Paper text:
These toxins recognise motor nerve terminals with high specificity and affinity by using a dual binding mechanism involving gangliosides and protein receptors. The ganglioside-binding site is a pocket built around the strictly conserved SxWY motif on the carboxy-terminal end of BoNT/A14.
Mutation of Y1117 to valine produced a 10-fold increase in affinity (KD) for the GD1a polysaccharide in solution and a 2.5-fold improvement of EC50 when measuring binding to immobilised gangliosides which is in good agreement with the 3.5-fold increase in synaptosomal binding. The high-resolution crystal structures of the HCA mutants in complex with the polysaccharides of GD1a for Y1117V and Y1117V/H1253K, as well as GM1a for H1253K were determined. The most noticeable differences reside in loop 1225–1233 that is shifted considerably in the Y1117V/H1253K:GD1a structure and disordered in the Y1117V:GD1a complex. Mutant Y1117V, while causing the loss of the Y1117V-Neu5Ac5 bond, provides additional hydrogen interactions between the hydroxyl group of Y1267 and Neu5Ac5, not seen in the wild-type toxin. Furthermore, the Y1117V mutant also presents more extensive bonds to Neu5Ac5 by interacting with the main chain of G1279 (N), and making water-mediated interactions with V1117 (O) and the side chain of D1118. In addition, it also causes the repositioning of residues 1277–1279 within hydrophobic range of Neu5Ac5. It should be noticed that these residues are closer (0.5–1 Å) to Neu5Ac5 in the Y1117V mutant compared to the Y1117V/H1253K. More surprisingly, mutation Y1117V led to conformational changes in loop 1270–1279 upon ligand binding, with residues 1276–1279 providing additional hydrophobic interaction.
Numbering used by the authors: 872 to 1227, 1231 to 1270, 1275 to 1297
The structure:
């Protein structure tokens, strides 16, 4: 059983951002809106008057009620707040308020906020708060799924990545008369360099339930394409820093290249900070990995689930090949960084797998017959957490050391590489 209650379903199709709902509400795109070159559903809004999108709702669907239930969902990527200018500065990003009644999404330092206000200025807020004083954040500068539901008899709820975060009572609000238009735009933000990314805005004419929200979250994640740490499509030929999810305070290094050497995790990462604003683990540490095309016949640059690839490791501005001799005794096969011309018959083919919580990747090493050597993780040998391929992993959650994320340099993180 399924029920459609769509009032606005904003999507890039053909060659245009349009409303796919039967209403086909009219859209105006300002001249300073950016779109991602590969996924044109990703919309970037700057702190500029012309970086905006306005939706004019059909009259039959404007919200003007005491009892009508409604929900919204959208994905958002919010760059790290860098300066004290952001500290006590709530700014609207999605506005459907007219004359101090309606609804809006706003942001503040470490916050996503939903506000409802009735025509007698009775107001309620539901708030998601996330810290910037944290080693590794699930939320800072990463694609987040937002869902907000409204039941006029009881509660408004905000969900993040399909999980309930905050619920507050709204049964005391009366007539909420929202705007005829929805304005996507940074409104009242003092940080001149602030922006957001947004995608897949929806409005629904019901209170969505927990199952509907989960299904919506799973579907829109696009599990067929692997993601980087930030939640963008993972790509071939792109240098990435590595994060192991069970040892997040460690980074990948190599001692020596060639079959006598090995790679290993070491830490701590050390810190990036601006006093009273953020304090996080440094992300741009260790040897970079580059994903290389092997078996995929697709001619775009995206790494798909189950793609069979090679992995290059960058040491001193030179590319080596991640590889192992699977014959070595023990289920754990230690990985080395080989000269590319000299890899010979060593195992190097990696099956890339997306795992669906944040943006998880697995890497299943295979020999040249296509037989499994195993998922790449790590193993303690003496004092040293060496990288290995091990079928022990394949034969077993966030317990295991075989989950990884790939971190490219991104403007919304602000860290400067050490070199």
């Amino acid at each position: 059983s399924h029920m459609d209650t769509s009032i606005l379903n904003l999507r890039y199709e053909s060659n245009h951002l349009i409303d796919l709902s039967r209403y086909a509400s009219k859209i105006n795109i300002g001249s300073k809106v950016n779109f991602d070159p590969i996924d044109k559903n990703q919309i970037q809004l700057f702190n500029l008057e012309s970086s905006k999108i306005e939706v004019i709702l059909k009259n039959a669907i404007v919200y003007n009620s005491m009892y009508e239930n409604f929900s919204t969902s959208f994905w958002i990527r919010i760059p790290k707040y860098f300066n004290s200018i952001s500290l006590n500065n709530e700014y609207t990003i999605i506005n459907c308020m007219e004359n101090n009644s309606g609804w809006k999404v706003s942001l503040n330092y470490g916050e996503i906020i939903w506000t409802l206000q009735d025509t007698q200025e009775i107001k309620q807020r539901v708030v998601f708060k996330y810290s910037q004083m944290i080693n590794i954040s699930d939320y800072i500068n990463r694609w987040i799924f937002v869902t907000i539901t409204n039941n006029r008899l009881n509660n408004s709820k905000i969900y993040i990545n399909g999980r309930l975060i905050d619920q507050k009572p709204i049964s005391n609000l009366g007539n909420i008369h929202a705007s005829n238009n929805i304005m996507f735009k940074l409104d009242g933000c003092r940080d001149t360099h602030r922006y957001i990314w947004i995608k897949y805005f929806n409005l629904f004419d019901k209170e969505l339930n927990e199952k509907e929200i989960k299904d919506l979250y799973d579907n829109q994640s696009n599990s067929g394409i692997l993601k980087d740490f930030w939640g963008d499509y993972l790509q071939y030929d792109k240098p990435y820093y590595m994060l192991n999810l069970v040892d997040p305070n460690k980074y990948v290094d190599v001692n020596n290249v060639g079959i006598r050497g090995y790679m290993y995790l070491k830490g701590p990462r050390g810190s990036v900070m601006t006093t009273n604003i953020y304090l996080n683990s440094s992300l741009y540490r260790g040897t970079k990995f580059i994903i290389k095309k092997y078996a995929s016949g697709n001619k775009d640059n995206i790494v798909r689930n189950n793609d069979r690839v090679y992995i290059n490791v960058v040491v001193k501005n030179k590319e080596y090949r991640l590889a192992t001799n699977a014959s070595q005794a023990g289920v754990e096969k230690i990985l080395s960084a080989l000269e590319i011309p000299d890899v010979g018959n060593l195992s190097q083919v990696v099956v890339m797998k997306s795992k669906n919580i944040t943006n998880k990747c697995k890497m299943n090493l295979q020999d040249n017959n296509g037989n499994d050597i195993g998922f790449i993780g790590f193993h303690q040998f003496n004092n040293i957490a060496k990288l290995v391929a091990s079928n022990w992993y394949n034969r077993q959650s966030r317990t295991l050391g075989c989950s990884w994320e790939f971190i490219p340099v991104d403007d919304g993180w602000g860290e400067r590489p050490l070199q």
